[PDB]
């Protein structure tokens, strides 16, 4: 709920390049300035003879807001022989997937084709490039000697990628073995050390790979999406992968052991052609240090009040338990054909409340398909069902839809303010956007009314005027606040009190404040972080019995507290915000004594 939508950082790429198709953060190991990584898989490059090779760009955070391509590969197509290319890099979609871990950047071209050395073929084995500072190596685990659709010739390796905690790569190739799909995992140390430009099919030791299976599993698309997390408690990240055509288009998600690629757990979708497994994520949302599985089914159709099926999409949340079982819940989209669940991004702890959070995208929702991203906050029970924020894409396009939210990445504190921030890609308008998380102020409020019981015949107070006394009581409102991260030590609060709030438009308010002679009192306050309860007393009274014949309904004393956000800003330009999960109103009630 604390993302700054007023002034997000806005980045652009060449028209038609799908800039923003993939996004990630880049944090070097030397604590250098952080950057944004943005894939533009259709971007034209300087590679000789290559049309729309695609590129990955590094973007400064706010120093200049500028993006410069990363030179993974400056060359064109290698030749097998004169006028006989060994490979085809045009329209290879380099940058369709991008992932970074510390110094390392992995970027892939899922539609890279190669010839093979025996016949003149054009097989989309896919390829990747791994950059670690000075050294860059090619990583094409599917460019092997297992040729054609039967083997890995159409694997499109790099279609999805992730890094494990222990510097292993997880790579998805949805085309292997007549589109069964495949998962391959290699140690980054093996990928760099064994790289030889003269060898097209590199033998990596300690490679883990799923194996070809029976034809019944054909056309399942294993490796369409991947995520990593530990699910047998041995500290080694395990491989989670969406399989969206499996089980006769119900969709499945496979989890494999990260040490040996043994099958661990399966999930199965409930509805045909829902694309269950289009997206997957793993993050501990309920704070028990057990990774939880998130699975997106963007085409899921829900039954409405009228009984009509409506395509709104669905996301399933599976909490991991010590026993090994899973506790599953479903989250439905809000707008028809919006494809809620197309992208699921762990946010880290967005509001720094102790529970991790997530963002779920509906890339085709909103006005004129501008796109919507939903923020969901975690809690001990699981994920909170109601989104606490709604980001709306602002840009429209003239051909392919903007697709705001089609890719996202969070869980990086790029401005070092103590709250993780979020990147949203919008490739149909060639835009990528960073949203910064605002500091969160938690307020403890107190309101005491004494005496609670009021006897009209107890007139011990005298009004400022002649009056001849009234029945009075005390009201004491207190307020206390603190925060986490970059914040000032002084905040201006606007506090409002309203006596006998129950009574509505056209009803008598029985209680009034002593001074004001009105039922409303407003007081500005100044409070500092970590400080003590700062209280204030004032006095109120009851009208004469003559003016109200309602002595039964209780008199409610209502208190509101708001904050002026502009005055608390910091060097970033980033105002804090009140914790939306503590209510900003409190109320007590007095009662009229009866005889």
């Amino acid at each position, epitope marked *: 709920f604390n993302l700054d939508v007023d002034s997000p950082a806005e980045y652009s790429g060449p028209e038609g390049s799908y800039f923003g198709f993939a996004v990630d953060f880049f944090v070097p190991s030397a604590s250098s300035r952080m950057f944004l990584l943005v894939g533009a898989p259709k971007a034209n490059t300087t590679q000789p003879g290559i049309v729309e090779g695609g590129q990955v760009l590094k973007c400064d955070w706010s120093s200049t807001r500028r993006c410069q391509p990363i030179e993974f590969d400056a060359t064109g197509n290698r030749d097998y*022989a004169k006028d006989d290319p060994l490979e085809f890099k045009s329209h290879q979609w380099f940058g369709a997937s991008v992932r970074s871990k510390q110094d390392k950047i992995l970027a892939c071209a899922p539609l890279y084709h190669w010839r093979t*050395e025996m016949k003149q073929e054009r097989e989309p084995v896919g390829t990747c490039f791994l950059q670690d500072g000075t050294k860059t190596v090619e990583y094409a685990p599917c460019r*092997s*000697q*297992d*040729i054609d659709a*039967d*083997g*890995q010739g159409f694997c499109q390796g790099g279609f999805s990628i992730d890094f494990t905690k222990a510097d292993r790569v997880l790579l998805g190739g949805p085309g292997s073995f007549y589109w069964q799909g495949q998962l391959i995992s290699d140690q980054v140390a093996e990928i760099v050390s*064994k790289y*030889d430009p*003269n*060898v*097209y*099919s590199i*033998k*990596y*030791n300690n*490679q883990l*790979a799923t*194996r*070809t299976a029976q034809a019944i599993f054909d056309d399942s698309y294993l490796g369409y999406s991947v995520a990593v997390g530990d699910f047998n408690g041995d500290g080694i990240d395990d491989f989670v992968s969406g399989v969206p055509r499996a089980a006769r288009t119900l969709g499945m998600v496979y989890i494999y052991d990260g040490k040996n690629m043994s099958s661990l757990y399966n999930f199965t979708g409930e509805q045909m052609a829902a694309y269950f497994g289009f997206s997957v994520a793993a993050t501990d949302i309920n704070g028990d240090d057990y990774a939880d599985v998130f699975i997106g089914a963007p085409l899921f159709m829900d039954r409405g009040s009228d009984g009509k099926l409506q395509e709104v999409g669905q996301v399933s949340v599976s909490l991991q338990r010590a026993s090994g079982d899973f506790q599953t819940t479903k989250l439905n989209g809000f707008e028809v054909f919006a494809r809620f669940g197309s992208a699921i991004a762990p946010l880290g702890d967005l509001d720094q409340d102790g529970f991790n959070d997530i963002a779920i995208a509906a890339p085709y929702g909103g006005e004129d398909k501008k796109g919507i991203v939903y923020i969901f906050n975690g809690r001990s029970t699981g994920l909170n069902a109601v989104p606490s924020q709604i980001l709306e894409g602002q840009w429209a396009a003239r051909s392919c839809p903007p697709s705001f939210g089609y890719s996202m990445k969070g869980a990086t504190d790029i401005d070092k303010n103590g709250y993780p921030d979020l990147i949203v890609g919008a490739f149909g308008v060639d835009r990528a956007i960073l949203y910064r998380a605002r500091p969160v102020i938690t307020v403890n409020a107190g309101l005491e009314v004494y005496p609670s019981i009021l006897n009209q015949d107890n007139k011990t107070c005298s009004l400022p005027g002649t009056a001849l006394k009234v029945s009075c009581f005390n009201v004491r409102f207190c307020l206390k606040a603190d925060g986490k991260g970059v914040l000032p030590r002084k905040l201006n609060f606007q506090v409002e009190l309203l006596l006998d709030k129950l009574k509505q438009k056209g009803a008598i308010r029985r209680a009034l404040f002593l001074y004001s002679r009105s039922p409303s009192h407003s007081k500005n306050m100044t409070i500092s972080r970590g400080g003590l309860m700062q209280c204030e007393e004032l006095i109120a009274y009851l009208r004469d019995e003559s003016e109200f014949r309602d002595k039964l309904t209780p008199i409610t004393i209502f208190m509101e507290y708001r904050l002026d956000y502009r005055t608390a800003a910091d060097t970033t330009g980033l105002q804090p915000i009140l914790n939306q999960f503590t209510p900003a109103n409190i109320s007590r009630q007095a009662h009229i004594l009866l005889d």
Partner: antibody
Amino acid sequence: QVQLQQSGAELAEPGASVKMSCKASGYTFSSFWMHWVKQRPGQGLEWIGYINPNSGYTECNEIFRDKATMTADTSSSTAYMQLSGLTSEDSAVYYCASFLGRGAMDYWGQGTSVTVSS
Amino acid sequence: DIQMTQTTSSLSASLGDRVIISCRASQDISNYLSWYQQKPDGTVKLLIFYTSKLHSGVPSRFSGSGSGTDYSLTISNLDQEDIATYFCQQGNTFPYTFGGGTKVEMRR
């Protein structure tokens, strides 16, 4: 740390057949072709053929088209060659060798001697 | 089939010497020529592939040259562990074929 471990020496009478194994480790066996090479005692090297382990497809030198049959067990990372119709001309050391690509074979097994004798 | 012929079947060398082994193919093999070392015990290792490319783990002393039909392996600064038999092999076209072999023995 590629290692091709071949089975022990074979003996057989003329007209019989033998089957030898070649177990691979250190790389993903099913992603690379396995080649087989025959060396007669006091003679040169002769290429038999190759197998694509994961699909079972094979190509052979014309000489050995009827002599040898190659197979593979992907679950145990083991290639097999059977020599049938044995004669004294089939007495030799038989090597397995993984395919580097680039028309070369990068790692060799120690060889399996075959002796054809009554 | 492509016929491979290593003209000299044996040559003798002293430690540190430079040894050159020549291989000729009966047709253009487009640089798909490899070199193998076979030790007395039968161990076989790949040294050079694609005419001049070095296999991983192979010492820099070994290098290869040639094009078309003529190719050569060169051992500079001969070592005691280099006494073995060396074969060339074309991989341009099936069936793969080897040369007859060249044995390198110490001088005495």
